[PDB]
């Protein structure tokens, strides 16, 4: 195998009215909160114009108030981008319920690219709506005495 | 505890000479091992009822034959029975090995399937990224399964696997990073993969309710002696690289835990009786001063000392608990002194002591 | 549902009912036959305990 | 098998009946018998020795499906 690279482009994801865009580059997050969405990314090759696809390119939520996390996977269609509407009313069984901020992570890598790239590109609030332990104690509540 | 005698199924005999450490230490703790090939016609487990092998090992990936009385119902009986089953598959699974998974309810993936991860890899790898490195931070942290020590990072290459999210019993040891999602090496994708996020368990076990410990490792190579020796240093830039691999330490205690020496419990005599007196007598009247007492013994190597018991609970239940205690340590037995509530009926006193890697004890009198 | 049980009638029969089986075959999940008469008067059923390995048993 | 023994009775050559009693030697509970006529050197005597023992066969499998053999 040869080596390869990765590059993102255009990215300016925008949050969708039932529709304003912003834009953000690949060093750092995007400032602001954007409640639902849909970022585009092109996913270019470096130092000679062209258009990859990764093996791998999930994208993630992370929720700080309960530690869980959600993984979903951006597929392209013949536009040369990518595209994660979220419709915030499907999807339900995904998302038992609703937590104020997540963490949105962008993990992609591939065999013959030499860096995998993952950092946030924007906060994202979405608002969309034991077995074995010591069990507590209990206590016999006597009748009163006449 | 149970017996020594253990029987060792190999996919080539091969493995006997590749897999040195692991097992000169597992002989060096008195077990007896009888290696046999996977596709021997002439093995059986069980003759009239015996169950001739105390405890199973099988290191064979890509078997579909595996003998005489060997089956998938055979080795379900034979954990019914108290046995102590430890599975190794590497890319190779096999459909009953598979099969088997399923019956515990540890799902393995297609044959051709590996968990691959391309931010935690080590430079030892040369390959399409699937000499995982994984973390003991993502761990499950009980002394009893994996040790009282420190470890070092640790590093496999097999396949993943799901946990059943029905099953109680289930338990995951060493689940992968968040960047692992164990698909096909080497082809797009285009379904959801098999447990894309941390969920990729890696190495699972199951703890029957007749206490039979059941260990479903991916990856035969993780216990071969070219990974206990092999120095790690991940791929990401300037990671430290650390002398000892720290998977030897990991390797023993988890056949410390599945072959009963590490974590075991026993329930002695119990006694109850009125407060002021020595024997049981039938029929207890309504608020009646009662003592409870019950020995358990740990087996600590094979010395059976009393057990610490810092939080072991004691239900006086009719159809749910009417009373819930806990249990001061006293003289070696367990006993407190209450009162019935004015309630009458029959009545059931209740210990449960379900613990992360201790051996699950229930007794009611 | 196979055991004859009169004459000119087909097999899967109840005689207090006069009928015909609805479901000839079926597996009992959580129930074991401990015992049954002679004539199919009583019959007395062994409830399982929860499955070995944790499975589900519907 | 000297514990599980239910009876033990000593014939002669054609119909007769003999007599044992229990001894004890100093064990295996000897017993002795009183033949009807003793034999001086050089004599043969045949003597029938019938003993029954229970609880003696086990069975093995211990444990046996509707629809298997002992
Ligand atoms: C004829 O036959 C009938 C059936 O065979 C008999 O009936 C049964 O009778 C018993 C006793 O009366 C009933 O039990 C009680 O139900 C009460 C109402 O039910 C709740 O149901 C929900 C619970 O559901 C599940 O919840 C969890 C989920 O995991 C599960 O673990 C649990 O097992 C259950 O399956 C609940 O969500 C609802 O909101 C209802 O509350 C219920 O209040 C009773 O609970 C008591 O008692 C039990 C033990 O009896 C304790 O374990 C509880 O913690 C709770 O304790 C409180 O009361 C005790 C005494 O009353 C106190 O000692 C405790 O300290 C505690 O006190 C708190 O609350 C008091 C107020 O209630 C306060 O004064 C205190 O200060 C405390 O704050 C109990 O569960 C059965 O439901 C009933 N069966 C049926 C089918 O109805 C009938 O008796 C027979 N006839 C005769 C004449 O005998």
């Not at chain 2, 990991?250 to 410390?256: K, Q």
Request: glycine share 6%; hydrophobic share 35%; charged share 25%.
């Amino acid at each position: 195998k040869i080596s390869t690279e990765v590059g993102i482009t255009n990215v300016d994801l925008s949050t969708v009215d039932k529709p304003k865009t912003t834009r953000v580059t690949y060093p750092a997050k995007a400032k602001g909160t954007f409640i639902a969405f849909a970022l585009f990314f092109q996913l270019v090759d470096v130092n000679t114009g062209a258009e990859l696809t990764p093996h791998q390119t999930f994208v993630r939520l992370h929720n700080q108030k309960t530690g869980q996390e959600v993984v979903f996977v951006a597929e392209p269609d013949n536009k040369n981008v990518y595209k994660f509407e979220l419709d915030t009313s499907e999807r339900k069984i995904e998302f038992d319920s609703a937590s104020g901020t997540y963490t949105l992570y962008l993990i992609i890598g591939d065999a013959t690219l030499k860096n995998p790239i993952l950092w946030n590109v924007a906060d994202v609030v979405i608002k969309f709506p034991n077995l074995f332990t010591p069990k507590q104690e209990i206590q016999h509540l006597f009748r009163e005495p006449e | 505890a149970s017996g020594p005698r253990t029987l060792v199924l190999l996919d080539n005999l091969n493995v006997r000479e590749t897999h040195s450490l692991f097992f000169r230490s597992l002989k060096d703790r008195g077990f007896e091992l009888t290696f046999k090939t996977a596709d021997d016609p002439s093995l059986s487990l069980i003759k009239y009822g015996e169950f001739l092998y105390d405890n199973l090992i099988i290191f064979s990936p890509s078997v579909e034959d595996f003998g005489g009385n060997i089956n998938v119902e055979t080795i379900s009986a034979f954990i019914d029975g108290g046995g102590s089953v430890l599975v190794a598959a590497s890319s190779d699974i096999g459909d009953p090995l598979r099969e088997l998974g399923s019956e515990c309810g540890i799902e393995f993936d297609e044959e051709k399937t590996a968990v691959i991860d391309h931010h935690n890899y080590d430079i030892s790898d040369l390959g399409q990224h699937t000499l995982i490195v994984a973390d003991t931070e993502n761990l499950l942290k009980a002394p009893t399964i994996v040790g009282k020590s420190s470890l070092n990072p640790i590093l496999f290459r097999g396949v993943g696997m799901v946990a059943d999210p029905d099953n109680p019993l289930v338990l995951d040891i060493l689940t992968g990073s968040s960047t692992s999602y164990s698909f096909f090496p080497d082809k797009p994708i285009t379904q959801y993969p098999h447990a894309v996020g941390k969920n990729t368990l890696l190495i699972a076990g199951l703890q029957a309710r007749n206490n039979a410990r059941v260990i479903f490792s991916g990856s035969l190579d993780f216990f071969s002696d070219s990974f206990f020796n092999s120095a790690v240093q991940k791929a990401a830039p300037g990671s430290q690289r650390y002398s000892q691999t720290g998977n030897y330490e990991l390797a023993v205690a988890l056949s410390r835990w599945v072959f009963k020496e590490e974590g075991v419990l026993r329930v002695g005599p119990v006694s109850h009786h009125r407060v002021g007196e020595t024997a049981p007598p039938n029929a207890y009247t309504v608020t009646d001063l009662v003592e409870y007492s019950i020995v358990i013994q740990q087996l600590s190597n094979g010395k059976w000392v009393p057990f610490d018991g810092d939080d072991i609970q004691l239900e006086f239940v009719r159809i749910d608990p009417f009373v819930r205690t806990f249990l001061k340590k006293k003289g070696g037995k367990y006993s407190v002194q209450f009162k019935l509530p004015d309630v009458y009926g029959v009545f059931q006193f209740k210990v449960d002591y379900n613990r992360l890697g201790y051996t699950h004890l229930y007794s009611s009198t | 549902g196979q055991v004859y049980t009169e004459a000119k009638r087909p097999p899967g029969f109840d005689r207090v009912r006069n009928a015909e089986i609805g479901n000839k075959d079926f597996e009992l999940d959580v129930l074991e036959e401990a015992y049954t008469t002679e004539h199919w008067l009583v019959r007395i059923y062994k409830v399982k305990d929860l499955d070995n390995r944790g499975l589900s048993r519907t | 098998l000297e514990a599980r023994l239910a009876h033990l009775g000593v014939q002669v050559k054609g119909e007769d009946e003999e007599e044992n009693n229990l001894e004890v030697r100093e064990s295996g509970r000897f017993f002795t018998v009183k033949l009807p006529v003793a034999l001086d050197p050089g004599a043969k005597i045949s003597v029938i020795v019938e003993t029954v023992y229970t609880h003696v066969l086990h069975p093995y499998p211990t444990q046996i499906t509707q629809s298997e053999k002992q």
